[model samples]
Target: QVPSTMKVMILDSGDPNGPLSRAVRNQLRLNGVELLDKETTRKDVPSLRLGKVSIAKDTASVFRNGQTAEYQMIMTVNATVLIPGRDIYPISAKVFRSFFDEQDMIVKEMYDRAAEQLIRKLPSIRAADIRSD
Candidate 1:
């Protein structure tokens, strides 16, 4: 489903405020991604949601590399794809935090990695006619 439209659904349930979301929106815009006005308030009828799970991390775990005063920080991000109406679409990315020995650098890397993942996947989803024949 090549999204001929530039709009992408954004779930701010927890309002993660991660750079991944921003990057996705930006990519959509820069690449002609039209954002849809999210209207995700369903206290009435049944709602259907489908899509992939995206994960991004900016924090690092501090661990001694040796008996000396040394430290190490690791960064990680993961994204998953989920399709609706199909029970086979159960995808979720674990929650991640941003810890920084260097906050600026971590944030910078965060957006870079996030953008990379989204750019890689957006095309596939946008390559077809969505879910219709």
Candidate 2:
């Protein structure tokens, strides 16, 4: 059974200070998930390890009367829940955006969207349903 409150540590596999990592933490905080510091040595707390994050831009494609570029952003993370033993649960989120001009604002938006998608799936994870890796 899921706990009423979950304490989780967010470990980033890529840039720890990147926008995606910050966004994930922000969303989790908003959702009432307890955040653990990276220095904590407590093994009982679950760890949410964020995997590779990538954003790719496709060649400009003709849309209607103009050309538009498609950006695809993907974020993957693993959730390690230790009930009695170690179990790894994989989670991922992807976002697609079409923009005439790619800018910093659009990129940030994609990162936030991807992070939100990934975090939204955390609540449904059941320790009994996951297999040890």
Candidate 3:
């Protein structure tokens, strides 16, 4: 069962300082989840292990003016929740975005959407549930 106050450590195999990682951290905070620092030694708290993250762009079509008409951006990441007492939950989160022009803002939005989807897949944690150690 999920605890009332979920405190978790994030272990990312990819760049920890990347936009996706930052988005995930921000999402967790916005959802009222406590984030444990990397140096923490607590063994009881759950740890979220994120596997390799990737973003791909596929061209769909092109305009007559030598400009891209439409393209698809896909972002994917494998995540695992490692809870104490030998419990584990695995999840894969993916987000797709179609755009007519290349923009960094779209990429950042995809990151945030991916993070939100990942968090939504996890078991619901209510404030009235059991507290974490």
Candidate 4:
């Protein structure tokens, strides 16, 4: 039987620090769910598998000087949730970030902001809520 709370195992794939993985783990923790590192056959724990993270970059000139510029970063992530007896739940999350600073600075800001936005959507995701075939 399903319980009020569920245990989750986040499978490591892509950049572990990527926005989607980071957000899902953070949100699940905040929501009072148990997170397991390794996989076990216990009936109560479900697994969330992450896929490769892809990025697209957009650059534009802010001034006539080549030094003045802007950059926009778009990232997409794929996630799969598996419960013992249910059809896999496929979840996808995307993040968009812009920066007028250095590459490293933009990367950091992109991940952090992505995590925050993704967290807001995680509450609606519950593996137990999905129907079985």
Using TM-score, give the best candidate's number: 3
**Model 2, range 1-133, lDDT digits (tens) per residue?**
2244354544544666878778877877777677777677777666666766766666546577676555443333343333325556677777776544446787788778877787666566653444323
The local distance difference test score of each candidate is: 0.42, 0.62, 0.72, 0.60
RMSD of 3: 5.3
Report the number of clashing residue pairs per model. Answer: 15, 0, 0, 0
Ordered list by TM-score, greatest first: 3, 2, 4, 1
CA lDDT of 90 in candidate 3? 77
Q: What residue pairs are clashing in model 2?
A: none
- lDDT string for model 3 (1-133, tens) is 3244354554544667888788888888887777876567877776777776888888876678886568788989878776567567777789888765637888888889888887876664232123443
- Candidate 4's residue-wise lDDT over 1-133, tens digit each? 2134354454555556655566666766765666776555556566667755667998887656556788888877666656556546666667788776466666655655554454443435563364322
> What's the best-to-worst order under lDDT?
3, 2, 4, 1
User: lDDT value for candidate 2?
Assistant: 0.62
Instruction: Give per-residue lDDT, candidate 2, residue 120.
Output: 67
- Report the lDDT of model 3 for residue 6: 57
For model 2 the local lDDT of residue 77 reads: 36
Per-residue lDDT tens digits for candidate 1, residues 1-133, read: 3244323443322233555565545654666544434465522211112243443434344457643332333334444333334222222223334322365555556566555555555445534425544
Misplaced by over 4 Å in model 4 are 1-3, 14-24, 60-70, 99-101, 116-123, 127-133
Stretches of candidate 2 off by over 4 Å are 1-7, 61-84, 127-133
RMSD of each: 7.4, 4.3, 5.3, 4.9
